[PDB]
Scaffold this motif. Structure first.
Motif, PDB file in Angstrom:
ATOM      1  N   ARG A 208       0.871  -1.166   0.000  1.00 25.80           N
ATOM      2  CA  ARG A 208       0.000   0.000   0.000  1.00 25.80           C
ATOM      3  C   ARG A 208       0.912   1.221   0.000  1.00 25.80           C
TER       4      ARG A 208
ATOM      5  N   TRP F  18      -8.621  -2.554  10.487  1.00 23.61           N
ATOM      6  CA  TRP F  18      -7.568  -1.691   9.968  1.00 23.61           C
ATOM      7  C   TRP F  18      -7.867  -1.398   8.503  1.00 23.61           C
ATOM      8  N   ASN F  38       8.416  -0.743   4.125  1.00 23.16           N
ATOM      9  CA  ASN F  38       8.058  -0.219   5.433  1.00 23.16           C
ATOM     10  C   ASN F  38       6.865   0.719   5.325  1.00 23.16           C
ATOM     11  N   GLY F  39       6.063   0.748   6.386  1.00 25.62           N
ATOM     12  CA  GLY F  39       4.829   1.500   6.380  1.00 25.62           C
ATOM     13  C   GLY F  39       3.669   0.795   5.723  1.00 25.62           C
ATOM     14  N   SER F  40       3.771  -0.512   5.493  1.00 32.62           N
ATOM     15  CA  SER F  40       2.748  -1.246   4.770  1.00 32.62           C
ATOM     16  C   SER F  40       1.890  -2.126   5.663  1.00 32.62           C
ATOM     17  N   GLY F  41       2.306  -2.375   6.898  1.00 28.35           N
ATOM     18  CA  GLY F  41       1.534  -3.198   7.815  1.00 28.35           C
ATOM     19  C   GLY F  41       2.201  -4.496   8.210  1.00 28.35           C
ATOM     20  N   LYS F  42       3.432  -4.752   7.779  1.00 31.09           N
ATOM     21  CA  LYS F  42       4.083  -6.007   8.124  1.00 31.09           C
ATOM     22  C   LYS F  42       4.196  -6.179   9.629  1.00 31.09           C
ATOM     23  N   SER F  43       4.106  -5.085  10.389  1.00 31.27           N
ATOM     24  CA  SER F  43       4.161  -5.187  11.844  1.00 31.27           C
ATOM     25  C   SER F  43       2.765  -5.187  12.452  1.00 31.27           C
ATOM     26  N   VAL F  44       1.877  -4.330  11.947  1.00 35.12           N
ATOM     27  CA  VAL F  44       0.553  -4.202  12.548  1.00 35.12           C
ATOM     28  C   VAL F  44      -0.233  -5.493  12.389  1.00 35.12           C
ATOM     29  N   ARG F  71      -0.200   3.603  20.901  1.00 37.93           N
ATOM     30  CA  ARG F  71      -1.436   3.386  20.160  1.00 37.93           C
ATOM     31  C   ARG F  71      -2.334   2.403  20.892  1.00 37.93           C
ATOM     32  N   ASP F  75      -7.232   2.406  17.610  1.00 41.37           N
ATOM     33  CA  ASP F  75      -6.509   3.070  16.535  1.00 41.37           C
ATOM     34  C   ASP F  75      -6.190   2.097  15.413  1.00 41.37           C
ATOM     35  N   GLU F  80      -5.982   5.398  10.467  1.00 40.33           N
ATOM     36  CA  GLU F  80      -5.777   6.837  10.548  1.00 40.33           C
ATOM     37  C   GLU F  80      -6.972   7.566   9.953  1.00 40.33           C
TER      38      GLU F  80
HETATM   39  N1  LIG Z   1      -3.039   5.211  14.956  1.00 40.47           N
HETATM   40  C1  LIG Z   1      -1.959   5.464  14.030  1.00 40.47           C
HETATM   41  N2  LIG Z   1      -1.220   6.550  14.162  1.00 40.47           N
HETATM   42  C2  LIG Z   1      -0.205   6.791  13.298  1.00 40.47           C
HETATM   43  N3  LIG Z   1       0.051   5.919  12.298  1.00 40.47           N
HETATM   44  C3  LIG Z   1      -0.708   4.820  12.174  1.00 40.47           C
HETATM   45  C4  LIG Z   1      -1.708   4.571  13.020  1.00 40.47           C
HETATM   46  N4  LIG Z   1      -2.301   3.413  12.671  1.00 40.47           N
HETATM   47  C5  LIG Z   1      -1.671   2.924  11.599  1.00 40.47           C
HETATM   48  N5  LIG Z   1      -0.713   3.797  11.336  1.00 40.47           N
HETATM   49  C6  LIG Z   1      -0.033   3.261  10.148  1.00 40.47           C
HETATM   50  O1  LIG Z   1       0.357   2.031  10.297  1.00 40.47           O
HETATM   51  C7  LIG Z   1       1.345   1.872   9.032  1.00 40.47           C
HETATM   52  C8  LIG Z   1       2.225   0.644   9.173  1.00 40.47           C
HETATM   53  O2  LIG Z   1       2.971   0.677  10.352  1.00 40.47           O
HETATM   54  P1  LIG Z   1       4.021  -0.567  10.584  1.00 40.47           P
HETATM   55  O3  LIG Z   1       3.534  -1.771   9.825  1.00 40.47           O
HETATM   56  O4  LIG Z   1       4.107  -0.885  12.051  1.00 40.47           O
HETATM   57  O5  LIG Z   1       5.512  -0.159  10.028  1.00 40.47           O
HETATM   58  P2  LIG Z   1       6.503  -1.261   9.318  1.00 40.47           P
HETATM   59  O6  LIG Z   1       5.706  -2.009   8.287  1.00 40.47           O
HETATM   60  O7  LIG Z   1       7.655  -0.565   8.641  1.00 40.47           O
HETATM   61  O8  LIG Z   1       7.028  -2.224  10.354  1.00 40.47           O
HETATM   62  C9  LIG Z   1       2.050   2.972   8.996  1.00 40.47           C
HETATM   63  O9  LIG Z   1       2.078   3.500   7.599  1.00 40.47           O
HETATM   64  C10 LIG Z   1       1.305   3.966   9.905  1.00 40.47           C
HETATM   65  O10 LIG Z   1       1.102   5.144   9.274  1.00 40.47           O
END
Ligand SMILES: Nc1ncnc2c1ncn2[C@@H]1O[C@H](COP(=O)(O)OP(=O)(O)O)[C@@H](O)[C@H]1O
Lengths: 243, 384, 372, 49, 50, 245, 49
Positions: A208, F18, F38-44, F71, F75, F80
């Motif tokens: 994304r 999400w 990075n910033g794609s959700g691999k952690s969330v 967070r 959230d 966001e």
């Molecule tokens: N409540 C929030 N506040 C700020 N950013 C958020 C929030 N929720 C989701 N994000 C988004 O979650 C996305 C993915 O984060 P993350 O997967 O943890 O980083 P990475 O994939 O590099 O490990 C980020 O692009 C971030 O913007």
């Protein structure tokens, strides 16, 4: 905690690692700061003392030690102007994790056992570093499960999988995880999971770009030699029909 | 080893502000959190605000004494002065009961009737008096001043013969703060403030500004030379930095108003905008005022002056344009009723004042901070 | 008044039982019956003691007795109970729990059978039709009851643990009540005149607003209010809010005509978006893979050979060169499925040309392995 | 809410009638706005359609 | 409760119990105190229990 | 006697959670490896799956990698506000265990409803009749034309015959242990989950040296939960208060 | 830079703001754990043409 560490050490000794190295861990009580108190080492000795050997005298001694510790808690409240409630000071004085310390040890082939300090660790090669860092963690997460039943799936979750291990040696880490038999969810920026020690594995790629509100999942597959795509049977039927 | 203002301290400060007090028996997590940083909180509150933080075995309380009292501050469940009178009389009664003593609702009603200080006797045969007593008892029970041994007070509305068994809880002792002199020597509430600020002669101005900012939704410029606003202007940057450091809020400053905004309001907080329909019309009125700058040119003090007739005309214009989307509550009510309701709402938020003498309406600059509109697709839908 | 030797007697009985079980059934049946008799006589004694004591602690007699001096009598009786009974429980429970952990049914069934022998030796004239297996089951259930009482079970807290926890709860309750007696006695400095003065003040209020103002001054503001905004948009001290750019909100019209929800809402199931994104991303990947393939020569790339190169290929090659030196094996991995080995010669002035700039760098060679 | 439940229980008992998703949305909203926007006639009219 | 526990008097009632207990206090078998300290229901508060 | 046949994790879903809309990640023999820029959700995604579904605790510390309070669960659930124009959702997370060498499937999942900064409900469930979400069971009916995730009562009705639905984290954790893990105590399960949380913390990747291992292990040991100390601290505070009075 | 412009080696010139987090002595030696050194002699020099 001692039983947990004992099981962990038993498992760490009861294998042979591809790096030609063997590890062992121990959980030992520390020495108190000074003799101006009932030395915490005495109290720890009494606590670890086997129940069979316990006696009314030892019980009295333990009660005395705890009385001294609580008196010290009140004294600390008065002396420390932080104004923290007695509950915090008790939770600090009686927190047993502070009484004990861990000691990791490694034994190169036909050489004496040594403690693994930072300095000694840096002398290691890449594979040795990876083994030393990621055997204690995996063996701990495996030791915990041994408390569990035989139905339990040994789960772990690694974030930024193996970041730091030199790209060549990640193969060995996956070999270890395979040997223990874990089920896991690992995420990485560059890890592809195409190492020949991985019997089978599923790779999902998320996309994304910056702000898109939908996550696009591109599901791969692995079999130890090649990385195909995945098209789901029902989805194969739908794709054939939906044209 | 020393304490520092951190996430825990910020959370504790917010919890202290947004509640009257925190009870150990009911809020153990909040009580524990507040107490741990209580040293830092006391230091900061004393230096900047001057509020007395009372930390006790059973409760923690921040004596939020306002700079200039405002309508929204008071106990909101009450709707008439008689409710406050009955509340105070009930407290006076509870002073006569020992902790965990049990008394029947009839005794409380009798004592309140006897003490009630008005020229006009309190009578229970009426409906309104009984309703007032029920509201007073509900607010009392809200603060856990009195516990309920099983029964039902709500029935008291329609059955004066109702009975209940109540229990005086310990908190009744500590509810009301202490007063400087023999309090009876004072003759009007305004005299209390002149005392509470007699203890804060040191840097009265900084405490004044901080209290106005944190308590009130906004801080309006009294005139061209208002000292509080001059202070804020002189120290805008460091004020903003300190407030950001110590709390969630972020300062704003304008020619005629200053206020603190909050970005992520937690559950227990009150904020504008909110669900109540009257806010929608407030936002629409703000937009309508923005749209005719020459007709509603604000005077130098930032106020916009309109007479009741002009305000009613504006409300009619709004009912014509956006009325299709208003809540059915307002859609069915005449213009003057909407004017009264909207003006009460705007009074609560210090958005406007009703001039005491001329009945002239003063819309304060704070209203123009926010504007609202329906989504364009509905508005075109409203055209259909 | 309980006996401080209760658990001492039970411990001695269990100690003799351990002593004999260590001798492994090499003794007469009468000894075993006597040992069991002592053990369970004492255990039933303790069971009655704990039942009565827990009834005393829970007593509503206590609950009403809080409101008087009689609580002092209850306090004295309770402290006697603790000093005689629970102190012994604490001193002896650990060893008892250990011994019971050792002695399961396995370490006992032969001893059960010899107990049964002695039971048969007794000329019981009772309604003894229950089989010898019934006697075995009775003894087994008795011993399992003892084991549950001390050691508990993986699914229930032991009887010992529940007793101890209730005792601690009661101790806190009693100490807190003494605190409350102190509070009741000390503080009485009534404020009644202040409250009645206050009621007099309130009744003088003309309308609700005045009364709320007075309440704020007297009791103190019950809360605070503030405006919600996502960012500190403005910075200009010199502009009135009206002339400044306002903050625009989307008022939700309060008619189902547009939207209003309380029960769970719906989502869009945007599969077409995902299909488009997947196809575009994979097409980009394939095209980059081809651009890399475009320069492949006999399975490898040598920079000196390249005449003119795409800037993207230049950046990819620089990335590979940088990464390769990090790995000691000089192996590299790529998202295209191509393992890549990088060898470097560094004595050379070779130019890698593209539309923008001519990059002088040390020559390299790139082998690609057989991912098959 | 109960009337909505009955209407969409009447549809799902008659499988021979093909209520697309779009028409289901139409009926859903028309019920949702009963007596505030549109009388019942707009619902049963679509069922009859 | 104890009276109701025994099978013979299992159906016991409060009124007969009160008659017998008043009879007993007449015989000084018991020391009577008035229960003005706490209550659990409105009627219990109004009752001058013992 | 034989050994029990070990469970294996092969599937992991999200539903209106999400930015995920309706995704289900398959596991090859219990293993899975997310990847992406990075910033794609691999952690969330992973934080949402593990260890949340193992016990159900959703407090900020569990989601937060640092152990900080950055967070909340809401959230993650809502996303966001700058990206998704919604302020009310119902999300479903679930994992689907399979017994190796057999065809029995047990599902466990969480159900949440959140209204932006207005309070988040939650209900947990466990299905045991061998139904699989997406083959002979569903979470969002197509009625009314759109897709609406089931509410608590509807989920309990459909599951109720074949599985349990509970509304407290404790009950959900006990259920999951009882069925899947079969720990002989709750405490051991809690310590296992604590160690899993520690593994998933990022200090390893940066400060790659042994003393990190000591901190990870030392943090894994379970401390004195406030309840056990509460009697002692309360009693001592009351006694000292009496002395001062 | 700016060390060889003037020669002021105090931590304020090294830290991107001026903090005492890192000092020139460690920059010369290298961190304690990473290397076994405890003494060293080094040079820094720029050349102008
Ligand atoms: N409540 C929030 N506040 C700020 N950013 C958020 C929030 N929720 C989701 N994000 C988004 O979650 C996305 C993915 O984060 P993350 O997967 O943890 O980083 P990475 O994939 O590099 O490990 C980020 O692009 C971030 O913007």
């Amino acid at each position: 905690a001692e039983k947990w560490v004992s099981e962990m050490d038993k498992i760490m000794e009861s294998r042979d690692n591809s790096s030609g190295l063997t590890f062992s861990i121990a959980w030992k009580p520390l020495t108190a700061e000074s003799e101006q108190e009932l030395d915490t080492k005495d109290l720890v000795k009494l606590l670890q003392r086997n129940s069979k050997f316990l006696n009314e005298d030892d019980l009295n001694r333990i009660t005395k030690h705890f009385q001294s510790r609580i008196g010290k808690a009140k004294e600390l409240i008065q002396l420390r102007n932080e104004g923290s409630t007695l509950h915090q000071v008790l939770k600090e004085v009686l927190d047993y994790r502070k009484w004990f310390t861990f000691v990791l040890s490694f034994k190169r082939v036909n050489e004496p056992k040594r403690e693994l300090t930072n300095n000694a660790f840096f002398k290691f090669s890449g594979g040795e570093k990876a083994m030393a860092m990621y055997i204690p963690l995996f063996t701990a997460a495996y030791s915990r499960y041994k408390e569990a039943g035989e139905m339990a799936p040994y789960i772990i979750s690694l974030d930024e999988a193996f970041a730091g291990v030199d790209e060549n040696n990640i193969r060995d880490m996956f070999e270890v995880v395979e040997q223990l038999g874990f089920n896991y969810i690992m995420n990485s920026q560059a890890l592809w999971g195409d190492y020949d020690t991985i019997s089978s594995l599923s790779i999902c790629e998320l996309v994304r770009p910056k702000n898109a509100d939908f996550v696009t999942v591109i599901r791969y597959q692995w079999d130890g030699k090649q990385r195909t795509f995945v098209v789901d049977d029902e989805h194969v039927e739908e794709l054939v029909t939906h044209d | 080893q020393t304490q520092l203002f951190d996430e825990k301290a910020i959370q504790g400060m917010d919890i202290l502000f947004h509640h009257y007090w925190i009870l150990r028996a009911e809020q153990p997590e909040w009580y524990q959190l507040i107490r741990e940083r209580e040293k830092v909180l006391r230091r900061y509150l004393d230096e900047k605000f001057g509020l007395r933080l009372i930390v006790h075995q059973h409760f923690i309380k921040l004596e939020k004494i306002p700079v200039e009292p405002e309508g929204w501050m008071g106990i909101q469940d009450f709707q008439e002065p008689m409710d406050y009178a009955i509340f105070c009389c009930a407290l006076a009664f509870l002073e006569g009961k020992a902790v965990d003593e049990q008394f029947l609702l009839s005794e409380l009603c009798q004592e309140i009737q006897a003490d009630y200080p008005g020229d006009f006797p309190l009578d229970w045969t009426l409906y309104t008096h009984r309703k007032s007593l029920i509201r007073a008892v509900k607010v009392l029970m809200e603060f856990q001043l009195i516990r309920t041994i099983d029964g039902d007070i709500g029935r008291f509305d329609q059955n004066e013969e109702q009975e209940v068994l109540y229990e005086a809880s310990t908190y009744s002792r500590y509810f009301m703060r202490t007063y400087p002199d023999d309090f009876s020597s004072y003759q009007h509430w305004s005299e209390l403030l002149k005392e509470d600020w007699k203890l804060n002669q040191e840097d009265e101005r900084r405490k004044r500004v901080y209290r106005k900012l944190f308590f009130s939704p906004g801080l309006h410029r009294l005139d061209q030379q208002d000292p509080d606003f001059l202070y804020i202007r002189n120290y805008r940057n460091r004020l903003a930095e300190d407030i950001e450091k110590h709390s969630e809020y972020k300062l704003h400053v304008y020619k005629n108003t200053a206020f603190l905004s909050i970005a992520e309001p937690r559950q227990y907080q009150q904020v504008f905008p909110n669900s109540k329909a009257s806010t929608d019309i407030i936002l629409q009125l703000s937009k309508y005022i923005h749209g005719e700058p020459e007709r509603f040119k604000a005077n130098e003090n930032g106020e916009i002056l309109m007479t009741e007739g002009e305000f009613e005309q504006v409300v009619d214009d709004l009912r014509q344009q956006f009325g299709t989307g208003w809540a059915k509550y307002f859609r069915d009510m005449s213009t003057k009723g909407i004017r009264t309701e909207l003006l009460r709402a705007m009074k609560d938020w210090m958005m406007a004042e009703v001039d005491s003498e001329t009945s002239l309406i003063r819309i304060k600059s704070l209203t123009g901070v926010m504007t609202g509109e329906y989504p364009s697709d509905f508005q075109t839908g409203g055209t259909e | 008044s309980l006996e401080r030797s209760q658990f001492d007697r039970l411990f001695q009985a269990i100690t003799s039982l351990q002593n004999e079980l260590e001798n492994d059934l090499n003794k007469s049946a009468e000894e075993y019956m006597r040992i069991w008799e002592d053990v369970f006589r004492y255990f039933q004694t303790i069971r009655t003691s704990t039942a009565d004591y827990i009834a005393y602690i829970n007593s509503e007699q206590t609950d009403q007795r809080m409101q008087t001096e009689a609580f002092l009598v209850y306090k004295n009786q309770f402290t006697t109970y603790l000093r005689d009974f629970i102190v012994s429980l604490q001193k002896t429970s650990l060893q008892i729990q250990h011994s019971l952990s050792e002695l399961t049914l396995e370490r006992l069934q032969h001893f059960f059978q010899k107990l049964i022998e002695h039971r048969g030796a007794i000329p019981r004239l009772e309604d003894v039709s229950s089989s010898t297996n019934d006697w075995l089951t009775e003894y087994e259930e008795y011993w399992f009851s003892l084991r549950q009482w001390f050691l508990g079970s993986a699914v229930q807290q032991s009887e010992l643990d529940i007793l101890q926890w209730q005792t601690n709860e009661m101790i806190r309750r009693m100490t807190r009540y003494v605190q409350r007696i102190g509070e009741r006695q000390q503080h009485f400095r009534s404020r009644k005149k202040d409250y009645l003065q206050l009621s007099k003040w309130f009744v003088e209020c003309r309308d609700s607003e005045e009364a709320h103002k007075l309440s704020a001054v007297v009791f103190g503001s019950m809360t605070i209010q503030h405006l919600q905004l996502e960012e500190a948009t403005t910075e200009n001290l010199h502009v009135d809010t009206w002339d400044e750019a306002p903050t625009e909100l989307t008022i939700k019209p309060r008619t189902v005509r547009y939207r209003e929800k309380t029960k769970p809402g719906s989502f869009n199931s945007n599969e077409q978006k995902k299909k488009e994104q997947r196809e575009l991303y994979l097409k980009e990947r394939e095209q980059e893979k081809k651009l890399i393939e475009k320069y492949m020569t006999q399975g490898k790339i040598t920079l000196s050979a390249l005449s003119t190169v795409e800037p993207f290929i230049r950046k990819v090659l620089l990335s590979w060169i940088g990464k390769s030196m990090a790995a000691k094996n000089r192996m590299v991995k790529t998202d295209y499925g191509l393992h890549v080995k990088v060898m470097l010669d560094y004595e050379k002035t070779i130019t890698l040309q593209a539309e923008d700039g001519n990059l002088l760098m040390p020559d390299a060679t790139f082998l690609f392995e057989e991912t098959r | 809410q109960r009337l909505e439940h009955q209407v969409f229980t009447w549809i799902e008992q008659h499988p021979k009638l093909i209520f697309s998703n779009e028409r289901r949305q139409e009926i859903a909203r028309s019920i949702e706005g009963l007596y505030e926007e549109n009388r019942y006639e707009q619902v049963r009219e679509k069922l009859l359609a | 409760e104890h009276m109701r526990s025994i099978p013979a008097f299992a159906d016991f009632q409060e009124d007969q119990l009160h008659q017998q207990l008043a009879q007993l206090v007449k015989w000084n078998n018991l020391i009577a105190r008035q229960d003005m300290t706490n209550a659990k229901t409105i009627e219990e508060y109004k009752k001058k229990r013992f | 006697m034989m050994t029990e046949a070990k469970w294996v994790m092969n599937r992991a879903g999200l539903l209106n959670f999400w930015y995920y809309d309706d995704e289900i990640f398959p596991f090859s023999d219990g293993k899975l490896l997310l990847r992406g820029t990075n910033g794609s959700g691999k952690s969330v995604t992973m934080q949402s799956f593990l260890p949340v579904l193992l016990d159900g605790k959703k407090s900020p510390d569990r989601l937060d990698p640092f152990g900080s309070k950055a967070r909340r669960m809401e959230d993650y659930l809502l996303g966001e506000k700058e990206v998704v124009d919604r302020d009310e959702r119902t999300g479903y997370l679930f994992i689907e265990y399979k017994k190796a060498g057999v065809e029995r499937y047990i599902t466990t999942g969480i159900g949440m409803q959140a209204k932006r900064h207005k309070g988040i409900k939650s209900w947990y469930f466990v299905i045991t009749d061998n139904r699989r979400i997406g083959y002979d069971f569903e979470l969002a009916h197509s009625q009314l034309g759109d897709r609406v995730p089931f509410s608590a009562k509807e989920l309990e009705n459909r599951i109720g015959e074949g599985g349990y639905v509970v509304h407290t984290q404790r009950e959900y954790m006990e259920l999951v242990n009882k069925y899947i893990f079969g720990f002989q105590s709750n405490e051991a399960y809690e310590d296992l989950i604590k160690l899993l949380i520690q593994l998933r913390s990022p200090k390893l990747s940066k400060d790659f040296k042994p003393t990190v291992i000591y901190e990870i292990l030392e943090s894994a040991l379970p401390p004195l939960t406030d309840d056990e100390l509460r009697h002692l601290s309360d009693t001592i505070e009351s006694m000292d208060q009496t002395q001062q009075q």
